[PDB]
From a paper:
Some of our experiments were performed using DNA mimics of the guide and target strands, so we first determined the structure of AfPiwi in complex with DNA mimics of guide and target strands, and compared the structure to a similar complex with RNA. The structure was determined by molecular replacement to a resolution of 1.9 Å. The structure superimposes closely with the RNA complex (Parker et al., 2005; Ma et al., 2005), with the guide strand anchored to AfPiwi via its 5′ phosphate group and the phosphodiester backbone of the seed region. At the 5′ end, the nucleic acid duplex is distorted such that the G1 and T1 bases are unwound with G1 being displaced into the conserved 5′ binding pocket. The target strand interacts primarily with the base edges of the guide. The principal differences are the formation of B-form duplex rather than A-form duplex and the insertion of the DNA T1 target nucleotide into a pocket in AfPiwi, forming interactions with Ile30, Phe151, and Asp154. In contrast, in the RNA complex, the T1 nucleotide is significantly distorted and exposed entirely to solvent, indicating that the RNA nucleotide is incompatible with the binding pocket. The interactions between conserved residues in AfPiwi and the phosphodiester backbone of the seed region of the guide are identical or similar in most cases to those in the RNA complex. AfPiwi binds DNA more tightly than RNA (Ma et al., 2005). Furthermore, the crystal structures of the AfPiwi RNA/RNA and DNA/DNA complexes show that in both cases target nucleotides T2 to T8 make no contacts to the protein, interacting with the complex through base pairing to the guide only.
Crystal structures show that the seed region of the guide strand is anchored via its phosphodiester backbone to the PIWI/MID domain of Argonaute and that this complex provides the platform for target mRNA recognition (Ma et al., 2005; Parker et al., 2005; Wang et al., 2008). We show, using isothermal titration calorimetry (ITC), that association with a PIWI/MID domain protein (AfPiwi from Archaeoglobus fulgidus) greatly enhances the affinity of the seed-target interaction. Thus, association of the guide strand with the PIWI/MID domain generates an enhanced affinity anchor site over the seed that can promote fidelity in target recognition and stabilize and guide the assembly of the active silencing complex.
Residue numbers in the entry: 11 to 302, 311 to 329, 339 to 412, 418 to 427
The structure:
Amino acid sequence: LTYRIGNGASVPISNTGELIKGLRNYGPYEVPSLKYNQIALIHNNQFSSLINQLKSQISSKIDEVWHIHNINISEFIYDSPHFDSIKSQVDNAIDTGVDGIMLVLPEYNTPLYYKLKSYLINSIPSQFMRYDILSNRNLTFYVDNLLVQFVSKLGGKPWILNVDPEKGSDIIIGTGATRIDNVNLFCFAMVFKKDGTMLWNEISPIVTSSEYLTYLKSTIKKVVYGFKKSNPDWDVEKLTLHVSGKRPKMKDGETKILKETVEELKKQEMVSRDVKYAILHLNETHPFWVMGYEGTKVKLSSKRYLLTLLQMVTPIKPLSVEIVSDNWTSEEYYHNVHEILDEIYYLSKMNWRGFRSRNLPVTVNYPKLVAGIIANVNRYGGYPIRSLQTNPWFL
DNA sequence: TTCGAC
DNA sequence: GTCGAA
Ligand SMILES: [Mn+2]
């Protein structure tokens, strides 16, 4: 595996230094198209040296690493570190014409982050930072990582997985639900390309456990309608679902409704009437240690598999993969199992939250990031959640 | 809320 | 919590 970046260039995975060097040389896979060529930096430390250094590093690295040229950074200063004062400056910024907001908070402050973050996600791409955490020693690493996620939030594509276009799924739908407490949950469905790029994402409102199966179906239907409306010629002959999340235990009823949903989409010509599909459950399992391997595919039964990833003692991060439903022929079966497992391994190398791979499939990881926000926006009574469907606002 | 491992 | 990363 390699990552594809700008200008047809590919760099090795598992190597941050070469990835950044690569970006500087060849640019990211896609430079975001900006409307204003302007970003706001909002903070409360007008004379702070660390803020000056932060701003200077953001300017240089946006230009040199990201090949986003001639961008202007405008500063906005809030006086009091509370919601209404910070909001007024967010408003002055939005009124001036900016592509994104980089907002420095005084410290870790959970209710204030969720109230503001929730308000920004509904308005404009944004990247938060904590004033109290900045340091001279960490600032380069800090800014390089932050820009991965901020460029992505602006609609850029830092890098994609180089995969063989003849193998794997036409689309992968990561779906399931996440309980936010003992009673309430939200369903999610996110469509990905085999190269790890998110094409479209839908999340349900917060609902009770009793409404889970109905909203699971409607959420998946909505995400495909939206993918297909925006990608009318994107045929899907090979479809995989990756089901995850802490959700109600209702396996057979859930599998039944997911096959119905695939059948309905077939009827509506959203996917091929001869689509080959599998429904998979993906579950993180307990780590183990090899006492003194990687991307290894383990068969437990005809339908249960593990994929092991690197995590004296070698720590291993295991992922359980169960094929709960498929319409594969028994002759293609073995071939298809290799293909879905290799695809899960490729997707586990895609993470636009930072340079370092999470070694967890993006189809599982990005829904976890959404969960964190939807759950805490609810708990701290923030603002409930089209640029949203196609952009990774949750990074 | 840099992220993510210890 | 605390710290190290190309
Ligand atoms: Mn983030």
